[PDB]
Amino acid sequence: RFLKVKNWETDVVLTDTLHLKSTLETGCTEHICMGSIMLPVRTKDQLFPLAKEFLDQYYSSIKRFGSKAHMDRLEEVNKEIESTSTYQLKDTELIYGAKHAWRNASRCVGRIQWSKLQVFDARDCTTAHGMFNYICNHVKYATNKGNLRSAITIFPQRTDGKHDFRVWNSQLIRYAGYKQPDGSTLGDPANVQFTEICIQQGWKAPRGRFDVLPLLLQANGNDPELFQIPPELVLEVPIRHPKFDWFKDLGLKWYGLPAVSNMLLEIGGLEFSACPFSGWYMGTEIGVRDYCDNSRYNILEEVAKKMDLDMRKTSSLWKDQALVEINIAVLYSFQSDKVTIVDHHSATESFIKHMENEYRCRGGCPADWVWIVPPMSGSITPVFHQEMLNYRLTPSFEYQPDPWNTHVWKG
Amino acid sequence: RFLKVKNWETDVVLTDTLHLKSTLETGCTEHICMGSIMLPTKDQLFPLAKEFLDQYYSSIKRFGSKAHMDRLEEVNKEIESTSTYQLKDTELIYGAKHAWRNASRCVGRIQWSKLQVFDARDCTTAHGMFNYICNHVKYATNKGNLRSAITIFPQRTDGKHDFRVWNSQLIRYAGYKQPDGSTLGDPANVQFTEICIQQGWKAPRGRFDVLPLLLQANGNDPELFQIPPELVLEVPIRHPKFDWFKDLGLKWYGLPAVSNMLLEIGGLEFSACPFSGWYMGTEIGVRDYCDNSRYNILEEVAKKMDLDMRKTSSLWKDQALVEINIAVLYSFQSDKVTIVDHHSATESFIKHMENEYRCRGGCPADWVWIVPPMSGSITPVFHQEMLNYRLTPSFEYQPDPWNTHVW
Ligand code: HEM
Ligand code: HEM
Ligand SMILES: Cc1ccnc(CCc2cccc([C@@H](N)Cc3cc(C)cc(N)n3)c2)c1
Numbered sequence: 001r002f003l004k005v006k007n008w009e010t011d012v013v014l015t016d017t018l019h020l021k022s023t024l025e026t027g028c029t030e031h032i033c034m035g036s037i038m039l040p041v042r043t044k045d046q047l048f049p050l051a052k053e054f055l056d057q058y059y060s061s062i063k064r065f066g067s068k069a070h071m072d073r074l075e076e077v078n079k080e081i082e083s084t085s086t087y088q089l090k091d092t093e094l095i096y097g098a099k100h101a102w103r104n105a106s107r108c109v110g111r112i113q114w115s116k117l118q119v120f121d122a123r124d125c126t127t128a129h130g131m132f133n134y135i136c137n138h139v140k141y142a143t144n145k146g147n148l149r150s151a152i153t154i155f156p157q158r159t160d161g162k163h164d165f166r167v168w169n170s171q172l173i174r175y176a177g178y179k180q181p182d183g184s185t186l187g188d189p190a191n192v193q194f195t196e197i198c199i200q201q202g203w204k205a206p207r208g209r210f211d212v213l214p215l216l217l218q219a220n221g222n223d224p225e226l227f228q229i230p231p232e233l234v235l236e237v238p239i240r241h242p243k244f245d246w247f248k249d250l251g252l253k254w255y256g257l258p259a260v261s262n263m264l265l266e267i268g269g270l271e272f273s274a275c276p277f278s279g280w281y282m283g284t285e286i287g288v289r290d291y292c293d294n295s296r297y298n299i300l301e302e303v304a305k306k307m308d309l310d311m312r313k314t315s316s317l318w319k320d321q322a323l324v325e326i327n328i329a330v331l332y333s334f335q336s337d338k339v340t341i342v343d344h345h346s347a348t349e350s351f352i353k354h355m356e357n358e359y360r361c362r363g364g365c366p367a368d369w370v371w372i373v374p375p376m377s378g379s380i381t382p383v384f385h386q387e388m389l390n391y392r393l394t395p396s397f398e399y400q401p402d403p404w405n406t407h408v409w410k411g
Numbered sequence: 412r413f414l415k416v417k418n419w420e421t422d423v424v425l426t427d428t429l430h431l432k433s434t435l436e437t438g439c440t441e442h443i444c445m446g447s448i449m450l451p452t453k454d455q456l457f458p459l460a461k462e463f464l465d466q467y468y469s470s471i472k473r474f475g476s477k478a479h480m481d482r483l484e485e486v487n488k489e490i491e492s493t494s495t496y497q498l499k500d501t502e503l504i505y506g507a508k509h510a511w512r513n514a515s516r517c518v519g520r521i522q523w524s525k526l527q528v529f530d531a532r533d534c535t536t537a538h539g540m541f542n543y544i545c546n547h548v549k550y551a552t553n554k555g556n557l558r559s560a561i562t563i564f565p566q567r568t569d570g571k572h573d574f575r576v577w578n579s580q581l582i583r584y585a586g587y588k589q590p591d592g593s594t595l596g597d598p599a600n601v602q603f604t605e606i607c608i609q610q611g612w613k614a615p616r617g618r619f620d621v622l623p624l625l626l627q628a629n630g631n632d633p634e635l636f637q638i639p640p641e642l643v644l645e646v647p648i649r650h651p652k653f654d655w656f657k658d659l660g661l662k663w664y665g666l667p668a669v670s671n672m673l674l675e676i677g678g679l680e681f682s683a684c685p686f687s688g689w690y691m692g693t694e695i696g697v698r699d700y701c702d703n704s705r706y707n708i709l710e711e712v713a714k715k716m717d718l719d720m721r722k723t724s725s726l727w728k729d730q731a732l733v734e735i736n737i738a739v740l741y742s743f744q745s746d747k748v749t750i751v752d753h754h755s756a757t758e759s760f761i762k763h764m765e766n767e768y769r770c771r772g773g774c775p776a777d778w779v780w781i782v783p784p785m786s787g788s789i790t791p792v793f794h795q796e797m798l799n800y801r802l803t804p805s806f807e808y809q810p811d812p813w814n815t816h817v818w
């Protein structure tokens with residue numbers, strides 16, 4: 001069965017056959033759509049089919065489906081599973097796995113880049129100090145003095161779920177948030193709970209507005225430990241505006257390297273619970289969400305005050321106006337400092353081309369419109385006008401519960 | 412079965428039980444979400460009749476009353492005999508108010524209960540339809556102080572005798588393809604504009620020519636009528652601090668009135684039911700003006716502002732987009748025509764959801780449509796999980812009649 005998606009700007013209609021190879025589920029039914037819901041132990045039993053399937057895909061992409069090397073690898077994974085209950089991925093398969101998990105990330109507008117991904121195999125890692133070393137190398141390599149490069153670092157897979165490797169930070173680099181006795185927040189409200197955990201684990205908090213949090217690292221199911229990323233490894237960009245000279249006086253900066261460290265990487269049934277990945281920012285992530293969400297730095301009021309906009313009625317669109325300037329300022333600061341960044345027009349146009357190519361060559365591109373459309377200027381970007389099919393493919397990145405909720409403390 | 416929605420900005424969490432009363436289907440499966448696709452007999456009719464009457468009599472706290480039961484028998488008899496039935500006025504009104512209440516794509520539903528319903532089931536001709544429509548237009552415009560209304564023509568019978576307003580809105584601008592290869596006026600309406608010309612309309616061939624009404628009664632060939640201009644309230648668009656803005660030539664009409672939709676009450680199909688309210692600023696400023704495929708004015712506006720259009724990264728489109736939208740709001744407010752900005756409308760819809768969760772057990776809502784097409788994340792609906800599901804009575808889309816009508 002085929003499925004059509006129309007682009008309502010261009011009349012381009014594409015045809016999906018890839019949704020056919022879909023395994024996992026959506027959350028939706030014939031009677032309810034969960035498309036805007038944010039967040040919708042594995043025995044031998046269920047493990048071999050998932051392995052077989054992954055290995056079938058892998059050998060297809062390398063044009064060796066049904067080869068002796070294909071068959072022998074199935075027979076070997078089979079034996080290894082029944083003998084040891086799990087199995088190890090070869091390097092090539094781990095690489096192919098990671099790439100495809102990015103490729104299959106239907107909420108990611110950045111996927112044109114999916115095939116250029118540096119994979120660091122950290123499966124020999126055994127300790128948190130080991131983890132910290134790996135991560136520092138990741139950060140240095142991906143940062144590359146501003147000319148950002150995609151990278152992922154993959155720590156050992158889950159075994160019995162009592163020996164998980166985890167990175168407690170939700171991103172490798174992120175700003176502290178501090179709840180004050182008066183109810184206000186200093187720094188980034190998104191990270192208050194994690195900041196508290198750090199202070200509790202012995203971190204001395206500078207208590208400023210932009211303090212880079214320490215890495216908090218769990219190896220082999222052990223209690224996690226603190227490590228300060230060397231400051232020389234953390235590239236930050238002071239934010240100014242090309243025409244507003246008072247803008248720098250707002251005291252704002254951001255870090256250059258977006259690196260998510262809380263997701264789980266599923267490949268051939270195996271679960272990598274610590275698999276930090278990084279790329280580069282789309283301007284709106286910092287300028288719309290990080291700065292202007294009501295639950296983040298929330299600078300809108302202060303930027304509008306400074307621009308002396310009519311703030312007495314919302315119909316003056318003083319919010320929209322400030323929002324655009326802040327976003328102009330973020331892009332201008334990054335480009336000026338030669339730190340890779342993409343604006344939302346360019347990213348979305350690129351993604352439409354990628355999506356078209358993926359239909360031509362792969363037979364589909366799963367895509368989550370709710371997430372793909374940018375959080376400002378939605379309809380002047382071409383994705384807004386693009387129908388999308390969302391469905392779940394493996395390999396995949398999945399959410400997992402925060403470790404402090406599930407972790408069994410050794411003491 | 413009992414479902415939770417979460418506002419990620421406020422942590423408010425609501426529980427949805429209303430979706431269990433869901434009759435219609437979404438287009439989604441467990442395998443594939445279709446949340447962003449634009450468009451997904453006596454024996455059939457009686458269950459539909461009952462569902463409706465059951466909810467009707469429930470709302471008036473008369474479920475399981477003689478009045479309830481007898482109506483059901485009365486309708487049952489009429490179905491058994493006539494193969495259709497007629498709604499009482501009260502049911503018709505309740506029906507319409509609820510079709511709007513269930514429109515999961517409408518951000519403006521806080522207002523749903525204040526709909527004025529004009530029952531035009533006694534209409535027999537296009538001239539009659541024209542008369543009902545002008546009355547609806549005038550009443551709804553209210554010298555700029557807009558009022559919600561729906562006018563309801565006779566229901567489907569054998570699908571050979573359909574009443575249809577061929578226009579997609581009662582008031583829209585003409586679209587003319589040109590020897591240049593580009594378009595004059597509104598590109599959305601180019602085909603309907605050919606149908607009008609190819610029916611007999613002398614087209615002024617301007618940028619902003621009010622289309623004629625093209626009305627079909629009882630399955631007959633449709634007819635042209637020009638809405639008295641004194642009844643078409645229009646706003647010239649200017650900027651609160653850009654003198655040159657007015658020279659861009661822009662105007663828009665005050666009354667948004669969708670005419671091509673099909674209203675379904677208790678299994679009955681009203682294929683001609685034009686309805687109107689008032690504009691959210693962005694509909695005109697973002698979509699009508701700035702859609703590449705609509706008036707697409709961003710290029711020209713940015714020029715006049717002398718912004719750097721050399722790289723996408725200056726955000727000049729964005730910058731112009733805001734100004735354009737400021738000017739729409741400003742012009743409407745200045746001319747005292749009702750209009751709501753996207754901040755205030757979305758805020759109201761949050762209050763409305765709260766109410767619907769508390770009073771009804773939920774509120775079907777389609778996030779992809781509710782979130783405005785500019786400044787999404789700075790409005791509160793962005794952060795609001797919404798459950799989308801289809802309830803009846805409803806408005807549904809229907810094929811364009813020129814594809815269907817037999818001459
Ligand atoms: C190359 C630079 C990149 C850009 C501009 C980019 C852009 C984005 C943006 C804007 C989002 C939405 C996130 C939000 O608003 O919170 C996103 C989500 C995502 N991205 Fe990419 N991305 C890039 C690289 C990558 C890489 C290297 C991976 C994985 C290897 C990745 C996987 C994902 C996943 C898994 C999500 C959403 C998680 C979910 O909620 O399911 N991204 N990305
Ligand atoms: C009171 C003023 C009103 C405002 C500000 C309002 C706002 C909106 C907006 C912004 C949309 C999105 C449509 C688009 O982007 O083109 C919408 C869709 C809709 N509205 Fe409302 N609305 C109002 C009154 C009404 C009334 C009176 C009805 C019916 C009685 C109604 C029924 C609908 C339907 C059926 C859709 C979407 C149709 C679909 O695609 O399924 N609206 N409205
Ligand atoms: C449950 C929940 C609640 C709130 N936010 C989230 C999303 C977390 C997240 C995941 C991937 C990318 C990003 C982005 N904000 C950060 C990012 C990462 C990468 C690799 C590239 C890029 N351009 N940007 C954020 C989840």
Ligand SMILES: Cc1ccnc(CCc2cccc([C@@H](N)Cc3cc(C)cc(N)n3)c2)c1
Nearest residue numbers: 449519667668669686687688689690691694
């Ligand atoms: C294929 C296709 C593509 C795009 N749109 C459609 C449906 C048209 C439509 C339906 C309801 C409201 C509106 C709105 N654009 C017009 C409107 C109507 C009312 C009553 C209030 C208001 N504020 N605005 C338009 C179909």
Ligand SMILES: C[C@H](O)[C@H](O)[C@H]1CNc2nc(N)[nH]c(=O)c2N1
Nearest residue numbers: 036037038370371793794795796
């Ligand atoms: C409730 C809603 O699903 C939630 O706010 C989503 C909407 N779309 C998003 N889109 C992106 N890119 N990032 C987000 O965090 C969100 N948040």
Ligand SMILES: C[C@H](O)[C@H](O)[C@H]1CNc2nc(N)[nH]c(=O)c2N1
Nearest residue numbers: 384385386387447448449779780
């Ligand atoms: C492809 C996508 O479904 C299409 O662009 C939709 C998205 N959201 C929308 N939202 C509103 N309010 N109006 C629209 O016309 C659309 N169009």
Ligand SMILES: [Zn+2]
Nearest residue numbers: 028033439444
């Ligand atoms: Zn869905």
